[PDB]
Amino acid sequence: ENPLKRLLVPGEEWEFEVTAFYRGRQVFQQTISCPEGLRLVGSEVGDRTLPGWPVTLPDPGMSLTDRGVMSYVRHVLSCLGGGLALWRAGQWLWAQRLGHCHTYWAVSEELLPNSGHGPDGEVPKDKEGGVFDLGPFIVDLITFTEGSGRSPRYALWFCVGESWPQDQPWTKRLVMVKVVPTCLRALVEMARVGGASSLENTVDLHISNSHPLSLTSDQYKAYLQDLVEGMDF
Amino acid sequence: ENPLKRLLVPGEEWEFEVTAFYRGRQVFQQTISCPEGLRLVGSEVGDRTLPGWPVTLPDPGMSLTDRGVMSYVRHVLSCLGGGLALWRAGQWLWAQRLGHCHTYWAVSEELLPNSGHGPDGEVPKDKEGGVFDLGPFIVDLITFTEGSGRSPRYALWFCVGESWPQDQPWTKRLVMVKVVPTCLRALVEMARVGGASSLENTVDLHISNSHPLSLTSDQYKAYLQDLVEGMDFQ
Amino acid sequence: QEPELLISGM
Amino acid sequence: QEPELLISGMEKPLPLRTDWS
Amino acid sequence: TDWS
């Protein structure tokens, strides 16, 4: 009855879009759906026994042009070990660092990882750490539909093997990974177009067992409010 | 004989990829080709006797979601006037501010306008301002093919109606426009892939009447060298 | 943190 | 200019190492 | 190696 509640139903799988950048250049993109989430890894062998879908970041390639720089990328990748794990449980996203690369994270904009205020945290190794709560996200999204606040951020950016580029151009970092749970992207775009009129617009939530929805803003905001009332704060 | 020299043959037009962002969000992207270059305008028109392909930046639209912010964007666009002119004279790119919006520029990364060293300059209003020189670019491209230099930058970023966002998140700027002469993107990509083997690779110069070229790294570096010996240096 | 517009004339 | 890698396991700085030779 |  509330289509958005499909987001949190037992057995649900979200799609996550992984985009990797080596020194400010997009080198890889893959979309994952898996109940155990995903692991950002370096090689396609060595660890094949861990839960979570392996997302192998590509070898930097061997060119006469930038081999000094890419050599560093290659070493970083080779130290990923079990990887950087990311998964969902209920309304929360969790991450854990299973290899040797110290990894910092922040929730930020699609195009700019480091808006200046520094990392939200370092991904823990010996315990999982919460990196996202859909509860506050949806509160902020409703505020956005009411024009009382900016578009909520949903892009998880990870800096791998180096300190967070606080007050530094992010493109200088060897390995930067953006992870977007694409449902959140879709929810924001829906609010964005919904503010332009009261005509119906289509949303694909990009989650398991969910066909596209065609809602007016009034209906969407109604569903958002019903959703957030059943969420944990 | 040297296919790369077609970059500078009189009468040829470069393709320019123009991408506009309102508050960090891509709102527009078009490829433009015109002997008199292009003019970034905000649909006041107002003169039809100006040179340059008019590139009309879209209305920010009306939404109950970011009404206040888009109002500022709209104001900037309403003050563009004759607009931001960008055009080529041989190996040089030139920019001139024809309207009332102060505009700052840098040659920077594809994905990041503000590398942290501030703007390369302010686009002047009553004379041409040089924003790019293919001479040094090609010298730096050759260095890159020899492994002893980073790839040269070629992405022109413009910040329109606000100061350059030095030490600030560029996504907060109302109107940022990236302009990529796509020949330069292609030249850089060709060197990158060329370093990885002695096989032929394909490079498309994206200029008028261009067709993809199939060159080995040796043939490509020879042509870069021949090209650079034909260009002007001060 | 409102924008400071830099437009001449007016 | 050079990146400074934050990778655990990289073995202590040469001064913090016991010289058994 | 050029890190700029």
Q: Are A216 and A200 in contact (CB under 8 A)?
A: yes
Tokens representing B206 are 């994206």
φ/ψ of B176, rounded to 5, equals -110, 130
Q: What sign has the CA pseudo-torsion A46, A52, A53, A54?
A: negative
- Using a CB-CB cut-off of 8 Å, the residues of chain D touching A101 are 6-7
Q: Are A151 and B172 in contact (CB under 8 A)?
A: no
The alpha carbon of A159 is separated from its chain's Cα centroid by a whole number of angstroms, namely: 13
How many Cβ atoms are within 10 Å of C4's Cβ, its own excluded?
A: 8
Measured CA to CA, the distance from residue A98 to residue A121 in angstroms comes to 16
Class of the A1-233 domain? mainly beta
Measured CA to CA, the distance from residue A112 to residue B110 in angstroms comes to 12
Strand partners, B55: B40
Buried b (16+ CB within 10 A) or exposed e, A172-206: bbbbbbbbbbbbbbbbbebbbbbbeeeeebebebb
Q: Which residues contact D19 (CB under 8 A, 6 or more apart)?
A: none
Q: Are A169 and B115 in contact (CB under 8 A)?
A: yes
Gaps in chain D (C to N over 2.5 angstroms) fall after none
Q: Are A52 and A38 in contact (CB under 8 A)?
A: yes
Q: Do A66 and B115 touch (CB under 8 A)?
A: no
- Best of B19, B22, B26, B65 to substitute, by most chain A Cβ atoms within 10 angstroms, is B65
Residue that has been written with the tokens 């001139």 in this structure? B96
Q: Which residue type does B33 have?
A: S
CATH number among 2.60.200.10, 3.40.30.10, 1.20.1530.20, 3.40.190.10, domain B1-234? 2.60.200.10
Q: Do chains B and A touch (3 or more CB pairs under 8 A)?
A: yes
Tokens representing B163 are 């100061």
Q: Residue A157's closest CA among A117, A127, A203, A186? A: A117
E1 to chain D nearest CA, in Å? 9
- Using a CB-CB cut-off of 8 Å, the residues of chain B touching C9 are 79, 100
Q: At B55, is the secondary structure helix, strand, or coil?
A: strand
Measured CA to CA, the distance from residue A229 to residue A226 in angstroms comes to 5
| Ramachandran quadrant class, B172 (left: phi over 0; alpha: psi -120 to 50; beta: rest) | alpha
E1 to chain B nearest CA, in Å? 6
Tokens representing A179 are 């992870």
Instruction: Flag whether residue D2 sits within 8 Å of chain E, measured between CB atoms.
Output: yes
B25 to chain A nearest CA, in Å? 8
Q: Are A174 and A22 in contact (CB under 8 A)?
A: yes
- Best of C4, C7, C10 to substitute, by most chain B Cβ atoms within 10 angstroms, is C7
Instruction: Flag whether residue E4 sits within 8 Å of chain A, measured between CB atoms.
Output: no
How many Cβ atoms are within 10 Å of A129's Cβ, its own excluded?
A: 16
Query: How far is the CA of A87 from the CAs of A15, A65, B1, B90, E1, in angstroms?
Result: 11, 37, 57, 54, 38
DSSP letter at B207 equals B
Going by their DSSP bridges, the two strands B25-32 and B16-22 should be labelled as antiparallel
Burial of A101 (0-12, 13-18, 19+ CB in 10 A): buried
Measured CA to CA, the distance from residue B97 to residue A230 in angstroms comes to 54
φ/ψ of A157, rounded to 5, equals -105, 130
Q: Do chains B and E touch (3 or more CB pairs under 8 A)?
A: yes
Q: Are A73 and A67 in contact (CB under 8 A)?
A: no
Q: Which residue type does A201 have?
A: N
Q: What sign has the CA pseudo-torsion A26, A30, A35, A39?
A: negative
Expressed in angstroms, the distance from the first to the final Cα of chain D is 34
- Using a CB-CB cut-off of 8 Å, the residues of chain E touching B150 are 2-4
Q: Which residues contact B187 (CB under 8 A, 6 or more apart)?
A: B141, B203, B205
DSSP letter at B21 equals E
Order the strands of the B92-97 sheet from edge to edge: B53-56, B38-41, B84-89, B92-97, B129-133
Q: Which residues contact A159 (CB under 8 A, 6 or more apart)?
A: A103, A104, A105, A113, A119, A165, A170, A173, A175, A176
Residue that has been written with the tokens 């109606």 in this structure? B161
Query: How far is the CA of B180 from the CAs of B19, B106, C10, in angstroms?
Result: 8, 12, 32
Measured CA to CA, the distance from residue B80 to residue B84 in angstroms comes to 7
Instruction: Flag whether residue B170 sits within 8 Å of chain A, measured between CB atoms.
Output: yes
Going by their DSSP bridges, the two strands A53-56 and A38-41 should be labelled as parallel
- Best of A21, A59, A65, A150 to substitute, by most chain B Cβ atoms within 10 angstroms, is A65
Gaps in chain C (C to N over 2.5 angstroms) fall after none
Measured CA to CA, the distance from residue A52 to residue A93 in angstroms comes to 13
- Restricting to B residues 173-192, those with a Cβ less than 8 Å away from any Cβ of A are 191-192
Element (H, E) at A67: helix A67-77
Q: Which residue type does B37 have?
A: G
Measured CA to CA, the distance from residue B113 to residue B170 in angstroms comes to 7
Q: Residue A103's closest CA among A56, A171, A157, A49? A: A157
Tokens representing B125 are 């209003």
Q: Which segments of B56-181 does DSSP mark as H helices, in order?
A: 67-77, 134-145
Q: Which residues contact B91 (CB under 8 A, 6 or more apart)?
A: B8, B133, B134, B135, B231, B232
Taking each continuous run of H as one helix and of E as one strand, the counts in chain E are 0, 0
Element (H, E) at A185: helix A182-194
Q: Which residue type does B103 have?
A: T
Packing angle, helices B182-194 and B134-145, rounded to 10: 20
Query: How far is the CA of B65 from the CAs of A188, A195, B77, in angstroms?
Result: 11, 6, 20
Q: Residue A131's closest CA among A141, A139, A140, A121? A: A121
E2 to chain D nearest CA, in Å? 8
